[PDB]
Design a protein around this ligand. Structure first.
Ligand SMILES: [Zn+2]
Ligand SMILES: [Zn+2]
Length: 47
C-alpha cells in the first residue's frame, strides 16, 4: 500500500525535492534539471 505522497504534478514517477521560494511553488529534481528551477532559490533541511 502506498497511495500517499507529495510528488510533482507532471512527474508522477518522481517525488519532490524542495520548495522554490522564488516562484513560491514546490518542485522536484526533474524540474531543476529539465525545467528552469536550477538557478532559482530553495530551502534545504527544514530549519
Ligand atoms: Zn517535476
Ligand atoms: Zn523555481
Amino acid at each position: 500500500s502506498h497511495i500517499r505522497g507529495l510528488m510533482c504534478l507532471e512527474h508522477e514517477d518522481e517525488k519532490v525535492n524542495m520548495y522554490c521560494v522564488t516562484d513560491d511553488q514546490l518542485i522536484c529534481a526533474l524540474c531543476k534539471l529539465v525545467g528552469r528551477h536550477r538557478d532559482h532559490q530553495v530551502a534545504a533541511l527544514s530549519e
